[PDB]
Design a binder for this molecule. Structure first.
Ligand code: HEM
Ligand code: CM5
Ligand code: CM5
Ligand code: TIC
Length: 466
């Protein structure tokens, strides 16, 4: 008997509830770290979970024993929708199949087809056009940022984008993004522990269910359109490539590529692909308002590398160390997925002298890496310095794992990072920014903190440069 990692003694049913913290799952995990260290077991309701804190511990599991920890566990409030299908929430061979398909696909588009950077560039331009019309007025960029991000996923997945005032677009927008806030509510974190009981009563889970059903409905009726226009020689977008692939194995009643796996993979792409990018952007700008000198510097460097004429492109990034550092530091401080996304182990496992039984849920707490004082002088202060060596060159940092690590690492890292780079720079190229609020009175504490973090809403003006 090697046994489970150390941790508090559970009650039946309640589990470790009486050891948790009212402030949420994260604060709980961090309190428990102080007592039990970087690898402990906490019983969430009746199911035990292994929490990993610190960079070292996270890395040993995810990179070193990469495969043992290649498993994905459920999120209670969304499991009824996903049910183990789609790229995010699938395991074993299904997941292996989907993720291989999902990379390849967005990974090229082809010799005539337009590319993801091209798409993002276009979105950026459309955005700057949109931001001009407001002629320097106070706004709340929340809806715009949700818009540009969803449009990138649409562009990829439906082969079209949507005007920022498109009303039925906006209805679905609103609906879909309300889900994110419900999902990271306190209620949803209680649901995580006790769904087995709360499933019988009204609560956020039902709302989240309806909203995701509505989008699923819309996804499905766009899958139909695509199907009756399918041109097997010029696959326009994601859905097409899938549908063609669905064809191949229509002869195999054991193939993973069917209707259900399609709808939910597309959901998955919006689900994982949209809010975090958007809130990163939103938070970037909040930060640049608190730290004008950074913004100035970012602008100075855009001036030198890109100029005022042409539009930022992706390989401008390798020539813009300070800017890449600011982005990295935005994501780091941002800390938008504090306790990561549930893994499970795929086999009994030895870890630091413990044995973890098959399918036990593992929670890699990325927040504890992003704030690791070994890798970040100043872990709780904004500081592009964390990513710049003495020669103003861009230095990798072991503590920096926002997209997580290993076999499950964010499938959209590439896209995501391009979005951040191109939107940040393209906006900053054409606009100064300002706020009623004085810099040093800009509170940066997140309004809500759950499986995602939300920065405070704030008002900003985008001023002209043209
Ligand atoms: C700020 C931007 C983003 C961040 C910080 C982010 C972060 C993450 C993180 C931390 C995970 C957990 C990986 C794990 O389980 O260990 C994840 C999973 C995932 N992300 Fe992202 N993501 C971002 C944007 C995107 C975009 C734009 C896409 C797709 C277009 C995307 C697609 C995915 C998918 C499909 C998964 C599930 C991976 C799997 O289970 O195989 N993400 N993401
Ligand atoms: O050593 C045990 C003593 O302390 C307890 O007080 C607990 C409370 O009962 C205990 O509930 C409280 O923690 C609150 C847990 C509430 C659950 C919070 C989680 C809910 C799910 C989502 C994550 C958060 O912490 C207090 C101490 O910090 C007992 O209640 C006392 O009566 C007892 O004398
Ligand atoms: O066949 C029905 C119609 O299909 C298209 O219009 C769709 C279009 O797809 C579009 O105009 C609209 O859908 C927009 C919804 C936004 C996409 C959903 C995404 C939003 C973010 C979160 C969920 C994903 O719904 C319209 C319904 O009329 C065609 O463009 C229309 O001409 C046609 O009338
Ligand atoms: Cl669902 C959610 C819920 C609340 C806040 C933010 C989010 C969005 N992120 C956290 C959950 C997952 S799983 C894979 C990618 C992501 C991105």
């Amino acid at each position: 008997k090697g046994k489970l990692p150390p941790g508090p003694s559970p009650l039946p049913v309640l589990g470790n509830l009486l050891q948790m913290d009212r402030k949420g799952l994260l604060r709980s995990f961090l309190r428990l770290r102080e007592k039990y260290g970087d690898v402990f077991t906490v019983y969430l309701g009746s199911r035990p979970v292994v929490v990993l804190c610190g960079t070292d511990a996270i890395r040993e599991a995810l990179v070193d024993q990469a495969e043992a920890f290649s498993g994905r566990g459920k999120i209670a409030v969304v499991d009824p929708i996903f049910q183990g299908y789609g790229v995010i929430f699938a395991n074993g061979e299904r997941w292996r199949a989907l993720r291989r398909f999902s990379l390849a696909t967005m990974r090229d588009f082809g010799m005539g087809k337009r590319s993801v950077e091209e798409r993002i560039q276009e979105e950026a331009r459309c955005l700057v056009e949109e931001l001009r019309k407001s002629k320097g007025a106070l706004l709340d960029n929340t809806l715009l940022f949700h818009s540009i991000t969803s449009n990138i996923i649409c562009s990829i997945v439906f082969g079209k984008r949507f005007d920022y005032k498109d009303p039925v677009f906006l209805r679905l927008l609103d609906l879909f993004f309300q889900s994110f806030s419900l999902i990271s509510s306190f209620s949803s974190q209680v649901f995580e522990l006790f769904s087995g009981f709360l499933k019988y009563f009204p609560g956020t889970h039902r709302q989240i269910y309806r909203n995701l059903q509505e989008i699923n409905t819309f996804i499905g009726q766009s899958v139909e359109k695509h199907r009756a226009t399918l041109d097997p020689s010029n696959p326009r977008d994601f859905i097409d490539v899938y549908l063609l692939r669905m064809e191949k194995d229509k002869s195999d009643p054991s193939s993973e590529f069917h209707h259900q796996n399609l709808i939910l993979t597309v959901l998955s792409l919006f689900f994982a692909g949209t809010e975090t990018t958007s809130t990163t952007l939103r938070y970037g700008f909040l930060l640049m308002l608190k730290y004008p000198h950074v913004t100035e510097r970012v602008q100075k460097e855009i001036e030198q590398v890109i100029g005022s004429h042409r539009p930022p492109a992706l390989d401008d990034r390798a020539k813009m160390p300070y800017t890449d550092a600011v982005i990295h530091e935005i994501q780091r401080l941002g800390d938008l997925i504090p306790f990561g996304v549930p893994h499970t182990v795929t086999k009994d496992t030895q870890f630091r002298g413990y044995v973890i039984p098959k399918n036990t849920e593992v929670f890699p707490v990325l927040s504890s890496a992003l704030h690791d004082p070994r890798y970040f002088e100043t872990p709780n202060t904004f500081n592009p310095g964390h990513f710049l060596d003495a020669n103003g060159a861009l230095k990798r940092n072991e503590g920096f794992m926002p997209f997580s690590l290993g076999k499950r690492i964010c499938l959209g890292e590439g896209i995501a990072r391009t979005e951040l780079f191109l939107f940040f720079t393209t906006i900053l190229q054409n606009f100064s920014i300002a706020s009623p609020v004085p810099p040093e009175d800009i509170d940066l504490t997140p309004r809500e903190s759950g499986v995602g973090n939300v920065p405070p809403s704030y008002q900003i003006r985008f001023l002209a440069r043209h």
